[PDB]
Ligand binder design. Sequence first.
Ligand SMILES: COc1ccc(S(=O)(=O)[C@H](CC(=O)O)C(F)F)cc1
Ligand SMILES: [Ca+2]
Ligand SMILES: [Ca+2]
Ligand SMILES: [Ca+2]
Ligand SMILES: [Cl-]
Ligand SMILES: [Cl-]
Ligand SMILES: [Zn+2]
Ligand SMILES: [Zn+2]
Length: 156
Amino acid sequence: DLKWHHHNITYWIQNYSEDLPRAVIDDAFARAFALWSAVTPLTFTRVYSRDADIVIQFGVAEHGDGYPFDGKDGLLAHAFPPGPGIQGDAHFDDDELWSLGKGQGYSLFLVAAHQFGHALGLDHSSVPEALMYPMYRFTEGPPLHKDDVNGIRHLY
Ligand SMILES: COc1ccc(S(=O)(=O)[C@H](CC(=O)O)C(F)F)cc1
Ligand SMILES: [Ca+2]
Ligand SMILES: [Ca+2]
Ligand SMILES: [Ca+2]
Ligand SMILES: [Cl-]
Ligand SMILES: [Cl-]
Ligand SMILES: [Zn+2]
Ligand SMILES: [Zn+2]
């Protein structure tokens, strides 16, 4: 039930997934963030310290928190809402097949954006076409839906 008191959010990519090249992943995340910063006064800067607002980590099964991943399929990832400590960090189940665009596997890009929303304070949308819909479904074109934009703007 909290939001970031600053608009200069920072993120730190802790480790990577074995499914994609590092530069591919970095870009994916950058583009994910870019989506929100585009409709809000928010900015996202990549840092290299635990001090980052949002820390990005890929994991398998137990990974620190009490919500370990379910291996292939199922829970794909999860991000904690705004707050101190672990709050804000986004976790990805490196047991999934991460990719982009058409084809098998889940889009790291689209999933990231979704999770970044949660890490910004956004809650799940009730619209099937919105990016904040709790159900993954690949789509082409603008990821954000009127509902997602209104949401993030009602916050920032
Ligand atoms: C497409 O964006 C996503 C929506 C839901 C998920 S999830 O399967 O991890 C979701 C939990 C979450 O959004 O973190 C669960 F269905 F409740 C991942 C990516
Ligand atoms: Ca899983
Ligand atoms: Ca994987
Ligand atoms: Ca693919
Ligand atoms: Cl790594
Ligand atoms: Cl994609
Ligand atoms: Zn976690
Ligand atoms: Zn979600």
